[PDB]
C-alpha cells in the first residue's frame, strides 16, 4: 500500500510549496492522479485476498472503499474552494492538509491487516474530522456538534479497545488472516455478551444505529461541505467495514445478540424515513436519509448471509456517491441564498435548468431506481431479509414507499412550483458546480454496467 | 379589424327563448338577457340532429354501397 500512502503524504509538501494561486489547481490535479492509480487494487483473486505485507492487505471489501476514498478527495477540494476564497493562505493550506491527512488515515484504516492497527487509524480519523467541523464550520452550534461527534464515538470505541486487547491475549493474534483460521466459537455467557457489545457498539455508533444517531444530524448541519461529503460518503462506512470484519469472531453468539439491533434498524428505518417527510432543513433531511439507508446495512451485516453481505457492500458504495452528491447539491443553493431552509427558495428549475437535472438524477438514485447500484444493493438486502423472516418484507416495502415520497418531496419543493419573488441573486451555475455534480453521478451510473466490482468478497 | 355581425338580427322570436318568455310572462316576470343567447338558436346552429340521427350518420351511403356489394356477390354466385 506504500504506492498509495507515500504519494498521499507527498500531497502535503505539494500544497505547501505551491505558488499562492495554485494550491487548488495543484492539489486537485495530483489527487486525481492518485485516484487513477487506485484502480490497480482491482487485482482480486477468486480464492485468496491481495496480501501486500505484514501490515496491509486488500480484498474485495476494502478495494471499492479505497477507490471511493481516493476519489472523494479531489471532489472535496473542488467543493470547498469557493467558500474558502477569503480565507488567508496559511489557513487554506491547513484546511487542505486536514483533508489529505484524512485520506492518509482512511486508506490505511481500510487495508490494515491487524485489528489494533485498524483501531488506531479508525480513531485517528476523529481528529482531522473534528478540526474541520469546529474550525471551518459556520455557526455557533459547530462547537457542540464537535463534542457530540467526539464523545459519542469515544463512548463506544474505548470498550472496543479493551475487547480487542483481550482477544489478542486470549487468541494470541489480531491479524485478520490469522483470525480466519484460529477463530473459535463464542459460547453463551454474560462475559461473552459484553465482549460482543464491546466489539460492536463502536461500529454501531458510526453507522449510526437508530437510537445512537442524534450526533449525525448535528454534525452535518454544522459541518462545511467537504466535512459533510467525507462524513456521509466514507466515515459512516468505517462502522460498516468494521462490523463486516469483526463479525467473523462473534459467531454463533450473533444469532441472538443481533435481535435488539435488527429491531432498532428495521423500525428505525421507518421512523427516520418518516422524519425526512417533515424536515425543514435541507442538510438535516439528507442526514436523516442516511440513517435510514444505513439501517439496511446494519440489518444485512447482522443476518450474515452471502446475499446480505453483497447487498451491504453495494449499498455502502452506492450511498456514498448519492449522499455526497445530495450534500453538494444542497450546498450549491446555500452558496446563493445562504440558508438551509428547504422552503426558502422554490421553483429553482425555472432559473437553473441543468442543475435541476442533477437534482432529478440524485433523487432517482436515492429512491433506488433500477438498475442503479442503489437498487441492486437495496434489493439484495431485501431478498436476504425475506429469507430471514418473510414478515420483514412489510417493513422493507413500506420504507420503499416513504423513501420515494421524501426524495420527490425534496425535488418538488425546491425545484418545482413558483420561484420565490424576492430572491434575485440566483446566478447561473458555475462550471465548477456542474463538474462537481457530474463527477458524482457519472461514476455511479457507470457502475451499473459492471456491478461485480462493488459487490464485495462474497461475489 | 374584426367585423361583428349587426346586433339587431338577434331576436328570440321563433326559438325556445320565446317559450321561456311566455312562461315568465304568466308570472309577471321578464327575461332581459334573452337576445344575448339568441345566436345559439339561429343560423347554422338552428337545427341539430337527434341522438339517433347522429348514430345513423353515413348510413344512407353505407347501405347503398352494401346493397350493391351483396348484389354483385349474388351475381357472381351464379356464374
Amino acid at each position: 500500500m506504500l504506492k498509495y500512502i507515500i504519494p498521499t503524504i507527498m500531497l502535503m509538501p505539494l500544497t505547501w510549496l505551491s505558488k499562492n494561486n495554485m494550491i487548488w489547481v495543484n492539489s486537485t490535479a495530483h489527487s486525481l492522479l492518485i485516484s487513477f492509480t487506485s484502480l490497480l487494487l482491482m487485482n482480486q483473486f477468486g480464492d485468496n485476498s491481495l496480501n501486500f505485507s505484514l501490515l496491509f492487505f486488500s480484498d474485495s471489501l476494502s478495494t471499492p472503499l479505497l477507490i471511493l476514498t481516493m476519489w472523494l478527495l479531489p471532489l472535496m477540494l473542488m467543493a470547498s474552494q469557493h467558500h474558502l476564497s477569503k480565507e488567508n493562505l496559511t489557513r487554506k493550506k491547513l484546511f487542505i492538509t486536514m483533508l489529505i491527512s484524512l485520506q492518509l488515515f482512511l486508506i490505511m484504516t481500510f487495508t490494515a491487516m491487524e485489528l489494533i492497527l485498524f483501531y488506531i487509524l479508525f480513531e485517528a480519523t476523529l481528529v482531522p474530522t473534528l478540526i474541520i467541523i469546529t474550525r471551518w464550520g459556520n455557526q455557533t452550534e459547530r462547537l457542540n456538534a464537535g463534542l457530540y461527534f467526539l464523545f459519542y464515538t469515544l463512548a463506544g470505541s474505548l470498550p472496543l479497545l479493551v475487547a480487542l486487547i483481550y482477544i489478542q491475549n486470549t487468541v494470541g493474534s489480531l491479524n485478520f488472516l490469522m483470525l480466519q483460521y484460529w477463530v473459535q466459537p463464542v459460547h453463551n455467557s454474560w462475559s461473552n455478551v459484553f465482549m460482543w457489545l464491546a466489539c460492536m457498539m463502536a461500529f454501531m455508533v458510526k453507522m449510526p444505529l437508530y437510537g445512537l444517531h442524534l450526533w449525525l444530524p448535528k454534525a452535518h448541519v454544522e459541518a462545511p461541505i467537504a466535512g459533510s461529503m467525507v462524513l456521509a460518503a466514507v466515515l459512516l462506512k468505517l462502522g460498516g467495514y468494521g462490523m463486516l470484519r469483526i463479525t467473523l469472531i462473534l459467531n454463533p453468539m450473533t444469532d441472538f445478540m443481533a435481535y435488539p439491533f435488527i429491531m432498532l434498524s428495521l423500525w428505525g428505518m421507518i421512523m427516520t424515513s418518516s422524519i425526512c417527510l417533515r424536515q425543514t432543513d435541507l442538510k438535516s433531511l439528507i442526514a436523516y436519509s442516511s440513517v435510514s439507508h444505513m439501517a439496511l446495512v446494519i440489518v444485512a451485516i447482522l443476518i450474515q448471509t452471502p446475499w446480505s453481505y453483497m447487498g451491504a457492500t453495494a449499498l455502502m458504495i452506492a450511498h456514498g456517491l448519492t449522499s455526497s452528491m445530495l450534500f453538494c447539491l444542497a450546498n450549491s443553493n446555500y452558496e446563493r441564498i445562504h440558508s438551509r431552509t428547504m422552503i426558502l427558495a422554490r421553483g429553482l428549475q425555472t432559473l437553473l435548468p441543468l442543475m435541476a437535472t442533477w437534482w432529478l438524477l440524485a433523487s432517482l438514485t436515492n429512491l433506488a431506481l433500477p438498475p442503479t447500484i442503489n437498487l441492486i444493493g437495496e434489493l439484495f438486502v431485501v431478498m436476504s431479509t425475506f429469507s430471514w423472516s418473510n414478515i420483514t418484507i412489510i417493513l422493507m416495502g413500506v420504507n420503499m414507499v416513504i423513501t420515494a415520497l421524501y426524495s420527490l418531496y425534496m425535488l418538488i419543493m425546491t425545484q418545482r412550483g413558483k420561484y420565490t419573488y424576492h430572491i434575485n441573486n440566483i446566478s447561473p451555475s458555475f462550471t465548477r458546480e456542474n463538474a462537481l455534480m457530474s463527477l458524482h453521478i457519472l461514476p455511479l451510473l457507470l457502475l451499473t454496467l459492471n456491478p461485480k466490482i462493488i459487490l464485495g468478497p462474497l461475489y | 379589424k374584426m367585423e361583428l355581425p349587426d346586433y339587431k338580427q338577434w331576436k328570440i322570436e321563433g326559438t325556445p327563448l320565446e317559450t321561456v318568455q311566455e312562461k315568465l310572462a304568466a308570472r309577471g316576470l321578464r327575461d332581459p338577457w334573452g337576445r344575448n343567447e339568441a345566436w345559439r338558436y339561429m343560423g347554422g346552429f338552428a337545427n341539430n340532429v337527434s341522438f339517433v340521427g347522429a348514430l345513423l350518420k353515413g348510413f344512407k351511403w353505407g347501405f347503398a354501397a352494401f346493397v350493391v356489394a351483396i348484389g354483385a356477390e349474388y351475381y357472381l354466385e351464379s356464374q
Partner: protein, 126 residues
C-alpha cells in the same frame, strides 16, 4: 341538516354564526389586524422594490419557524406523565412488538426445519 365540521373539513365561513354578528369590538380587532398586515407589507415592499438590493430578504417569521421546529424544543420540554407515557408507548413498545413478531416467526420456522417439515427443495440462495 346542519354542517358537522371535522378536523379535516372546516366549517364554511358562510355558515359560521360569528361572521354575521359583527360588534364594534370585533370590527376594532379586524382593523387592528389589517394594521399589522399593512405595516409588514410596507416593510417588505420597501426592500422588495429597492433597485439596488441583490440577495434574499430575510424573514424573521421564517427564521423563528425553523428555529422553533428544532432548536427550541428541548429547552421547553418537561418530563411529566404525558411525555414519559407517550415517550414509552412509541419509543420502546414498537420495538417489543416487532421483536415478538419476528422472534415468534423465526422460532416457528426453526422448529420446522429441524424436523424436516419446512419445504426447502430448491432453496440454495440466502
Amino acid at each position: 341538516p346542519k354542517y358537522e365540521a371535522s378536523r379535516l373539513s372546516s366549517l364554511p365561513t358562510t355558515l359560521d354564526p360569528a361572521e354575521y354578528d359583527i360588534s364594534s369590538e370585533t370590527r376594532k380587532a379586524q382593523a387592528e389586524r389589517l394594521a399589522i398586515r399593512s405595516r409588514l407589507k410596507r416593510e417588505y415592499q420597501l426592500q422588495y422594490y429597492d433597485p439596488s438590493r441583490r440577495g434574499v430578504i430575510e424573514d424573521p417569521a421564517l427564521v423563528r419557524w425553523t428555529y422553533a421546529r428544532s432548536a427550541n424544543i428541548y429547552p421547553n420540554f418537561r418530563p411529566n406523565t404525558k411525555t414519559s407515557l407517550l415517550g414509552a408507548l412509541f419509543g420502546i413498545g414498537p420495538l417489543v412488538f416487532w421483536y415478538y413478531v419476528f422472534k415468534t416467526d423465526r422460532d416457528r420456522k426453526e422448529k420446522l426445519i429441524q424436523e424436516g417439515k419446512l419445504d426447502r427443495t430448491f432453496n440454495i440462495s440466502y
